[PDB]
Design a binder for this molecule. Sequence first.
Ligand SMILES: *[C@@H]1O[C@H](CO)[C@@H](O[C@@H]2O[C@H](CO)[C@@H](O[C@@H]3O[C@H](CO)[C@@H](O)[C@H](O)[C@@H]3O)[C@H](O)[C@H]2NC(C)=O)[C@H](O)[C@H]1NC(C)=O
Ligand SMILES: *[C@@H]1O[C@H](CO[C@@H]2O[C@@H](C)[C@@H](O)[C@@H](O)[C@@H]2O)[C@@H](O[C@@H]2O[C@H](CO)[C@@H](O)[C@H](O)[C@H]2NC(C)=O)[C@H](O)[C@H]1NC(C)=O
Ligand SMILES: *[C@@H]1O[C@H](CO)[C@@H](O[C@@H]2O[C@H](CO)[C@@H](O)[C@H](O)[C@H]2NC(C)=O)[C@H](O)[C@H]1NC(C)=O
Ligand SMILES: *[C@@H]1O[C@H](CO)[C@@H](O[C@@H]2O[C@H](CO)[C@@H](O)[C@H](O)[C@H]2NC(C)=O)[C@H](O)[C@H]1NC(C)=O
Ligand SMILES: *[C@@H]1O[C@H](CO)[C@@H](O[C@@H]2O[C@H](CO)[C@@H](O)[C@H](O)[C@H]2NC(C)=O)[C@H](O)[C@H]1NC(C)=O
Ligand SMILES: *[C@@H]1O[C@H](CO)[C@@H](O[C@@H]2O[C@H](CO)[C@@H](O)[C@H](O)[C@H]2NC(C)=O)[C@H](O)[C@H]1NC(C)=O
Ligand SMILES: Nc1ccn([C@@H]2O[C@H](COP(=O)(O)OP(=O)(O)O)[C@@H](O)[C@H]2O)c(=O)n1
Ligand SMILES: Nc1ccn([C@@H]2O[C@H](COP(=O)(O)OP(=O)(O)O)[C@@H](O)[C@H]2O)c(=O)n1
Ligand SMILES: *[C@@H]1O[C@H](CO)[C@@H](O)[C@H](O)[C@H]1NC(C)=O
Ligand SMILES: *[C@@H]1O[C@H](CO)[C@@H](O)[C@H](O)[C@H]1NC(C)=O
Lengths: 291, 277
Amino acid sequence: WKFNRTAFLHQRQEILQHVDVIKNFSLTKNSVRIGQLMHYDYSSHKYVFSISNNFRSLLPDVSPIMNKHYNICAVVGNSGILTGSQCGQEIDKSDFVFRCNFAPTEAFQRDVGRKTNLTTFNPSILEKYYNNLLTIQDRNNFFLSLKKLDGAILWIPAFFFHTSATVTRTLVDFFVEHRGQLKVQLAWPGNIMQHVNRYWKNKHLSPKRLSTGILMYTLASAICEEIHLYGFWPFGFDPNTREDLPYHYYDKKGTKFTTKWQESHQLPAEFQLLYRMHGEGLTKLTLSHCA
Amino acid sequence: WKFNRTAFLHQRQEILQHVDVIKNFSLTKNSVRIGQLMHYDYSSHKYVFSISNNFRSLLPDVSPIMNKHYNICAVVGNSGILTGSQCGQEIDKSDFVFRCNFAPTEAFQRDVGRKTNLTTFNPSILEKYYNNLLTIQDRNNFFLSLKKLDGAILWIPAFFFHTSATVTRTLVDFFVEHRGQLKVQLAWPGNIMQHVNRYWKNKHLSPKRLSTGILMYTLASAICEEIHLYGFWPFGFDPNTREDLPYHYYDQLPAEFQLLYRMHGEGLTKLTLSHCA
Ligand SMILES: *[C@@H]1O[C@H](CO)[C@@H](O[C@@H]2O[C@H](CO)[C@@H](O[C@@H]3O[C@H](CO)[C@@H](O)[C@H](O)[C@@H]3O)[C@H](O)[C@H]2NC(C)=O)[C@H](O)[C@H]1NC(C)=O
Ligand SMILES: *[C@@H]1O[C@H](CO[C@@H]2O[C@@H](C)[C@@H](O)[C@@H](O)[C@@H]2O)[C@@H](O[C@@H]2O[C@H](CO)[C@@H](O)[C@H](O)[C@H]2NC(C)=O)[C@H](O)[C@H]1NC(C)=O
Ligand SMILES: *[C@@H]1O[C@H](CO)[C@@H](O[C@@H]2O[C@H](CO)[C@@H](O)[C@H](O)[C@H]2NC(C)=O)[C@H](O)[C@H]1NC(C)=O
Ligand SMILES: *[C@@H]1O[C@H](CO)[C@@H](O[C@@H]2O[C@H](CO)[C@@H](O)[C@H](O)[C@H]2NC(C)=O)[C@H](O)[C@H]1NC(C)=O
Ligand SMILES: *[C@@H]1O[C@H](CO)[C@@H](O[C@@H]2O[C@H](CO)[C@@H](O)[C@H](O)[C@H]2NC(C)=O)[C@H](O)[C@H]1NC(C)=O
Ligand SMILES: *[C@@H]1O[C@H](CO)[C@@H](O[C@@H]2O[C@H](CO)[C@@H](O)[C@H](O)[C@H]2NC(C)=O)[C@H](O)[C@H]1NC(C)=O
Ligand SMILES: Nc1ccn([C@@H]2O[C@H](COP(=O)(O)OP(=O)(O)O)[C@@H](O)[C@H]2O)c(=O)n1
Ligand SMILES: Nc1ccn([C@@H]2O[C@H](COP(=O)(O)OP(=O)(O)O)[C@@H](O)[C@H]2O)c(=O)n1
Ligand SMILES: *[C@@H]1O[C@H](CO)[C@@H](O)[C@H](O)[C@H]1NC(C)=O
Ligand SMILES: *[C@@H]1O[C@H](CO)[C@@H](O)[C@H](O)[C@H]1NC(C)=O
């Protein structure tokens, strides 16, 4: 594998022609009005969400990636290929590390690293893992999780799925209540998928829904000089050993591979395109143990 | 049935010496702090709700019932005993009418009246009847429902059950969003059940939980000269025929009922169990 910087920069420029990444990265205070009704990228149009004073107060003033530049970036997907890879040190050497869905690192650092500079966060995490912040203990656990992120960007897409609606108020209220107590940089993308979908539709990838991993690639393209991908491997066997693999690296040993998404996604089609991109030197896809 | 004003005035005085009704009626802006953690009267202590700026902004400045005095009050429970009663006109002749849980009147006026001066509102009503205000149509329907109340009090107990927590944020955000567009007067009781329970504990009624109906009686005792109860009949069978009756007219309560029946017999209050006409 040898990086082709020219072709990567061309890709960047092509992405930027279709998606204003710096802007799309997050709503800002001055781009929303109090009382504005948002709709959801992936739900029926009837679902709405009214922007409150408090929601607006958590938006950044300027794009958190404006005038930011990182030389080597790691984008870490969640594939079971990472278990046993020992990629953690190599991942953490990156200038900037992107992670998906608040993925755990604690038990897994040797394989996936501990550096996090951005992690994505669907609001429904609060429902699944923090009991809607109903108790003192829930609130404390969520607070600690956030504190461990230090100054990283928490990239919260509250306008993709309508089922985010009522949990988003809880999350907004939690952050307003704790204003100034955490260093996490909040980012809140708006209705961006139609713009992102345009670039990838031209590359002959058009599922109903693009994966978080490729969305992160798209964002990374604008601010990273060189992108190294880890944990992109949507298959139940290891490419080198042929052994069974789980879907996620944090799945217990012996978990059988079963696909998270059907119909809505085309992870194999994503992977194939990224693999082609690897071959063209646009990005480095890692599929084996790290030295 | 004949009112015993003497004994009623004695009851009022006893209730007031155990429960500060005017204060307990609603939290006020200055009685909470932003960031204060509320607990729930009927849930485990571990459940909390943080008071926001916005929640506080919806509290009244002063108890809405301070220095209010009404002559005849109706407290209207939701029993199916009201179906066919034709009590609407008699209920609406009251000076002040208390209703429970935002109960519908329009299709049932002949039996239950259309006068409303206070109605209670469990936040979970948004979940059951207004789809968490997720769509435009839901928001419009809830707005129209609130507008029909005009200047009545909407008495919202958000701190009895922890299952109110998440819907309460939706309700708060809806009211902030619509600030100044409705005339409804909001009231928000806090942790009052242990204080209300004290009076009723001495009357040998001590469930787990007092019902909204008897909570409304209690409040009424402070601002009414005479209280007439309707729709209190916690049984699935008609008192006279024993044929099935629904629970609600718009479809330990028996101990409460027994006490209210005894109170009727003492002339404290009038419990209507039959047709008005
Ligand atoms: C995500 O980025 C896209 C662009 O990739 C943003 O869409 C763009 O929004 C701007 C609004 O400033 C549009 O500019 C306007 O163009 C018209 C001419 O077509 C001009 O008359 C106006 O004065 C203005 O310059 C631009 O057209 C539009 N591009 C597309 C393809 O729709 C989008 O706003 C971003 N979304 C978020 C939530 O950040
Ligand atoms: C930005 O990074 C490039 C590339 O760095 C190399 O590849 C990375 C994946 C990682 O393994 C690095 O340690 C490698 O050095 C840098 O370009 C290299 O610069 C070094 C040190 O001066 C030089 O010896 C190499 O020949 C260069 N390699 C290439 C491919 O150009 C570049 O210097 C970095 N710039 C900054 C400001 O950090
Ligand atoms: C880096 O990638 C670019 C773009 O794909 C390569 O440039 C192409 O080179 C082939 C050689 O036959 C031509 O057919 C294309 O038309 C070229 N395109 C452009 C824009 O130059 C380049 O060869 C790659 N570099 C390396 C070192 O492999
Ligand atoms: C990316 O995030 C990591 C934390 O994951 C940052 O690295 C830490 O930086 C602090 C403050 O300088 C150090 O004291 C820690 O020792 C570092 N931790 C690790 C795990 O490396 C890093 O600075 C961030 N990079 C950015 C924002 O470019
Ligand atoms: C409801 O009214 C009661 C009094 O009937 C209030 O109880 C008093 O509260 C103060 C302040 O906490 C205590 O110091 C007193 O000891 C309490 N008195 C009694 C008799 O218990 C209560 O605070 C009111 N609650 C609300 C929410 O309004
Ligand atoms: C109690 O509530 C009723 C409304 O349900 C009030 O009666 C209305 O008063 C307005 C203004 O005078 C009239 O235009 C309406 O026609 C009345 N409606 C009905 C159904 O009577 C009543 O004034 C309130 N009483 C108190 C004491 O506040
Ligand atoms: N077996 C897997 C699992 C995830 N992935 C990638 O890793 C990302 C993070 O995984 P996830 O399961 O948490 O992601 P989503 O369900 O949000 O897409 C995905 O969006 C994919 O791009 C993969 O390539 N192979
Ligand atoms: N069949 C019934 C229904 C309601 N009720 C009373 O009417 C009140 C209002 O009814 P509800 O069922 O809407 O009230 P909750 O107690 O459920 O808040 C109850 O609290 C009871 O005091 C009754 O006595 N008999
Ligand atoms: C009114 O109630 C009091 C208190 O129990 C009683 O002594 C009095 O005789 C009652 N009057 C009636 C039933 O007329
Ligand atoms: C209260 O209601 C009674 C009974 O209808 C009535 O006769 C009386 O005049 C009313 N007013 C006052 C001030 O008591």
